[PDB]
C-alpha cells in the first residue's frame, strides 16, 4: 500500500548511498539495510539510489545497477525491485526537471535490471498500453530499444 517514514528514510539512506558511490562496497550498503530492517520501504532503496545516481557521474549509475543486482536476493526480493521501478516511473516527471535525460537513463536502468534477471522480461510489456505519462513511456521505449540490441 503506502510506505512509512519516507522523509526520514531519504535523510537516513542518502549519505549511505553517496558514500557507496565512493567506496564501491555493496556489502556495506547491505549491512546498513540489515540493521534498518525496512518494511515495504525496502522498495524505496533502488528508487533513491537511482535518483541520486541520475544527478551524479555515469560511473555512479553503473555502480547503482551493480548494487541493485547484489542487493536483490540478499536484503530484498524481485518483488521489491519491481515495486521500486514502478515508483521510479511515477517519479520520472519530477526527476526530469533536474535531469532532462532522466527518462533515457531510467531506460538503461530497466534494461540492465532485466539483463541481470532482477526484473521480469515481461515487466515492460505489461506497461505497453497502460501508461499515460509520456515520460514513463519514453523510459519504457528506451529500455525496449536497449534490450533489442542486447
Ligand atoms: Cl534510442
Ligand atoms: Na541491475
UniProtKB/Swiss-Prot annotation:
Localisation: Nucleus; Cytoplasm
Domain MI: 8-129
Swiss-Prot/TrEMBL induction comment: IL2/interleukin-2 stimulation inhibits expression, while IL12/interleukin-12 increases expression.
Segments carrying motif Nuclear localization signal: 86-95
Reported tissue expression: Up-regulated in proliferative cells. Highly expressed in epithelial cells of the mammary gland. Reduced expression in lung cancer and colon carcinoma.
Modification comment: Polyubiquitinated, leading to its proteasomal degradation. Rapidly degraded in response to mitogens. Phosphorylation of the phosphodegron promotes interaction with BTRC and proteasomal degradation.
Effect the entry attributes to changing residue 97 to A: Strongly reduced interaction with EIF4A1. Reduced inhibition of EIF4A1 helicase activity. Strongly reduced inhibition of translation
Record text about domains: Binds EIF4A1 via both MI domains.
Chain's role: Inhibits translation initiation and cap-dependent translation. May excert its function by hindering the interaction between EIF4A1 and EIF4G. Inhibits the helicase activity of EIF4A. Modulates the activation of JUN kinase. Down-regulates the expression of MAP4K1, thus inhibiting events important in driving invasion, namely, MAPK85 activation and consequent JUN-dependent transcription. May play a role in apoptosis. Tumor suppressor. Inhibits tumor promoter-induced neoplastic transformation. Binds RNA.
Self-association and partners: Interacts (via MI domains) with EIF4A2. Interacts (via MI domains) with EIF4A1 (via N-terminal domain). Heterotrimer with EIF4A1; one molecule of PDCD4 binds two molecules of EIF4A1. Interacts with EIF4G1. May form a complex with EIF4A1 and EIF4G1. The interaction between PDCD4 and EIF4A1 interferes with the interaction between EIF4A1 and EIF4G. When phosphorylated, interacts with BTRC and FBXW11.
Record family assignment: Belongs to the PDCD4 family.
Name the record gives this protein: Programmed cell death protein 4
Species assigned in the record: Homo sapiens
Amino acid at each position: 500500500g503506502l510506505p512509512l517514514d519516507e522523509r526520514a528514510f531519504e535523510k537516513t539512506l542518502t549519505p549511505i548511498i553517496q558514500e557507496y558511490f565512493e567506496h564501491g562496497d555493496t556489502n556495506e550498503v547491505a549491512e546498513m539495510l540489515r540493521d534498518l530492517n525496512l518494511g515495504e520501504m525496502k522498495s524505496g532503496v533502488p528508487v533513491l539510489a537511482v535518483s541520486l545516481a541520475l544527478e551524479g557521474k555515469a560511473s555512479h549509475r553503473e555502480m547503482t545497477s551493480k548494487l541493485l543486482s547484489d542487493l536483490c536476493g540478499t536484503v530484498m526480493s524481485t518483488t521489491d525491485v519491481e515495486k521500486s521501478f514502478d515508483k521510479l516511473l511515477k517519479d520520472l516527471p519530477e526527476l526530469a526537471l533536474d535531469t532532462p535525460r532522466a527518462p533515457q537513463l531510467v531506460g538503461q536502468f530497466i534494461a540492465r535490471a532485466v539483463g541481470d534477471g532482477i526484473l521480469c522480461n515481461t515487466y515492460i510489456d505489461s506497461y505497453k498500453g497502460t501508461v499515460d505519462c509520456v515520460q514513463a513511456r519514453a523510459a519504457l521505449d528506451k529500455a525496449t530499444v536497449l534490450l533489442s540490441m542486447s
